[PDB]
Design a protein around this motif. Structure first.
Motif, PDB file in Angstrom:
ATOM      1  N   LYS A  23       0.823  -1.212   0.000  1.00  0.00           N
ATOM      2  CA  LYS A  23       0.000   0.000   0.000  1.00  0.00           C
ATOM      3  C   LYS A  23       0.858   1.263   0.000  1.00  0.00           C
ATOM      4  N   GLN A  27       0.999   3.911  -3.053  1.00  0.00           N
ATOM      5  CA  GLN A  27       0.736   5.334  -2.860  1.00  0.00           C
ATOM      6  C   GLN A  27       1.901   6.189  -3.351  1.00  0.00           C
ATOM      7  N   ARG A  28       3.137   5.699  -3.191  1.00  0.00           N
ATOM      8  CA  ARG A  28       4.298   6.395  -3.745  1.00  0.00           C
ATOM      9  C   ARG A  28       4.247   6.431  -5.271  1.00  0.00           C
ATOM     10  N   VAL A  31       1.624   9.018  -6.269  1.00  0.00           N
ATOM     11  CA  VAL A  31       2.146  10.383  -6.167  1.00  0.00           C
ATOM     12  C   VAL A  31       3.097  10.688  -7.325  1.00  0.00           C
ATOM     13  N   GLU A  32       3.948   9.713  -7.687  1.00  0.00           N
ATOM     14  CA  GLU A  32       4.828   9.826  -8.852  1.00  0.00           C
ATOM     15  C   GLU A  32       4.044  10.097 -10.135  1.00  0.00           C
ATOM     16  N   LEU A  35       2.091  13.678 -10.007  1.00  0.00           N
ATOM     17  CA  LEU A  35       2.947  14.830 -10.290  1.00  0.00           C
ATOM     18  C   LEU A  35       3.514  14.767 -11.708  1.00  0.00           C
ATOM     19  N   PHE A  38       0.717  16.060 -13.828  1.00  0.00           N
ATOM     20  CA  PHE A  38       0.525  17.477 -13.517  1.00  0.00           C
ATOM     21  C   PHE A  38       1.518  18.357 -14.268  1.00  0.00           C
ATOM     22  N   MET A  39       2.814  18.173 -14.012  1.00  0.00           N
ATOM     23  CA  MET A  39       3.763  18.994 -14.756  1.00  0.00           C
ATOM     24  C   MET A  39       4.038  18.472 -16.161  1.00  0.00           C
ATOM     25  N   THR A  42       1.378  20.622 -17.676  1.00  0.00           N
ATOM     26  CA  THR A  42       1.515  22.027 -17.301  1.00  0.00           C
ATOM     27  C   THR A  42       2.473  22.786 -18.220  1.00  0.00           C
TER      28      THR A  42
ATOM     29  N   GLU B   3       8.267  14.043  -2.011  1.00  0.00           N
ATOM     30  CA  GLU B   3       7.266  14.410  -3.014  1.00  0.00           C
ATOM     31  C   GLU B   3       5.951  14.869  -2.391  1.00  0.00           C
ATOM     32  N   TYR B   7       4.306  18.264  -3.810  1.00  0.00           N
ATOM     33  CA  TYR B   7       2.919  18.333  -4.262  1.00  0.00           C
ATOM     34  C   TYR B   7       2.118  19.337  -3.441  1.00  0.00           C
ATOM     35  N   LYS B  22      -4.246  27.179 -14.742  1.00  0.00           N
ATOM     36  CA  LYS B  22      -3.707  26.336 -13.681  1.00  0.00           C
ATOM     37  C   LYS B  22      -4.689  26.195 -12.526  1.00  0.00           C
ATOM     38  N   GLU B  25      -7.166  23.614 -13.822  1.00  0.00           N
ATOM     39  CA  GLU B  25      -6.483  22.331 -13.955  1.00  0.00           C
ATOM     40  C   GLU B  25      -6.189  21.717 -12.591  1.00  0.00           C
ATOM     41  N   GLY B  35      -6.801   8.081  -4.641  1.00  0.00           N
ATOM     42  CA  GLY B  35      -5.965   7.765  -3.500  1.00  0.00           C
ATOM     43  C   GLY B  35      -5.201   8.917  -2.887  1.00  0.00           C
TER      44      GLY B  35
END
Lengths: 52, 257
Positions: A23, A27-28, A31-32, A35, A38-39, A42, B3, B7, B22, B25, B35
């Motif tokens: 788990k 979750q790591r 998050v990887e 992000l 996201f970028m 972006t 991280e 974030y 942004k 977004e 999660g």
């Protein structure tokens, strides 16, 4: 004992070592990839195929 | 790890920065995160403390940013938000109180955007009344103590009427109906007398707007729509015949299907 006596409640045990670290690593990874997306969407972007 | 706060830093700088692409977004990101928790305590703590700071600083833009942040928290089917709801209920509702310490006109339209925040309060009441029944009772007692008494500014009465409007059908049917006429007489005391209190005048004007264009359909359902002037006499004059006109408009909208 349903009327006279009482007891105590904890209601939360799992205790699964390999499942806990699965788990945590999932979750790591989440998050990887979050992000990453996201970028990825972006900033300045060059893709692998055409318009990925 | 590392991280987590990266974030957190970028999502709070998107929360504060006014980059509108942004902005949208990041809102869709929070709406589409599978999660994303264990940052939720720091997320909600930043929300509550930013609500307190923005009440002190009176910045409507950061307030609607935080309300869209709460909306983005709502739109995730993965967030079991339950145990942290006790931090969101002040942080939204403190926004539905504050003491008119901004500028007047457009911030009154931003009070209508805080009625959209009362729509968020309605979504919280829809999704989180599964407790040993406390949440709806607490919010209705708070709105009743705001609504009933005197020495209550138009921000507080406006937010209470807006929250009871968003709570739904029988709230307007049972709780607003008895002293509708007495608060109409309060607005009539604001009307026809003094002139140079225009904050309170425009406040009572769109209080009348909320009362009319949200209490029209429940009176259209209960009271039959003949006798418009008798309906005004039964509802203290000023609502009619605009009450009956909006009831006819609601009947036309219901018959539109």
């Amino acid at each position: 004992x349903x009327x006279x006596x009482x007891x105590x409640x904890x209601x939360x045990x799992x205790x699964x070592y390999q499942v806990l670290r699965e788990k945590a690593a999932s979750q790591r990874r989440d998050v990887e990839r979050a992000l990453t997306r996201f970028m990825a969407k972006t900033g300045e972007t060059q893709s692998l195929f055409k318009d990925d | 790890s590392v991280e987590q706060q990266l974030y957190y830093k970028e999502i709070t700088e998107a929360c504060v920065g006014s980059c509108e692409a942004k902005r949208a977004e990041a809102l869709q990101s929070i709406a589409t995160d599978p999660g994303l928790y264990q940052m939720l305590p720091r997320f909600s703590t930043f929300i509550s403390e930013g609500v307190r700071v923005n009440v002190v600083q009176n910045n409507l833009a950061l307030l609607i940013y935080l309300m869209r942040m709460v909306k983005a928290l709502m739109d995730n089917p993965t967030l079991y938000l339950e145990k942290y709801v006790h931090e969101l209920i002040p942080a939204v509702m403190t926004c539905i109180v504050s003491r008119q310490l901004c500028l007047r006109p457009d911030v009154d339209n931003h009070w209508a955007l805080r009625d959209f925040a009362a729509r968020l309060v309605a979504q919280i009441c829809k999704h989180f009344s599964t407790t040993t029944n406390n949440i709806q009772s607490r919010i209705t007692k708070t709105f009743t103590k705001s609504w009933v008494d005197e020495k209550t500014p138009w921000t507080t009465r406006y937010g209470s009427i807006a929250g009871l409007a968003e709570l739904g059908h029988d709230v307007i049917k049972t709780l607003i109906l008895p002293r509708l006429q007495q608060e109409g007489e309060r607005i009539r005391s604001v009307l026809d007398g003094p002139v140079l209190s225009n904050i309170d005048r425009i406040g009572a004007d769109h209080v009348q707007s909320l009362l009319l264009k949200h209490c029209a359909p429940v009176l259209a359902k209960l009271r039959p729509p003949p006798d418009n002037q008798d309906a005004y006499r039964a509802e203290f004059g000023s609502l009619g015949p605009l009450l009956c006109s909006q009831v006819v408009k609601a009947r036309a909208q219901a018959a539109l299907q």
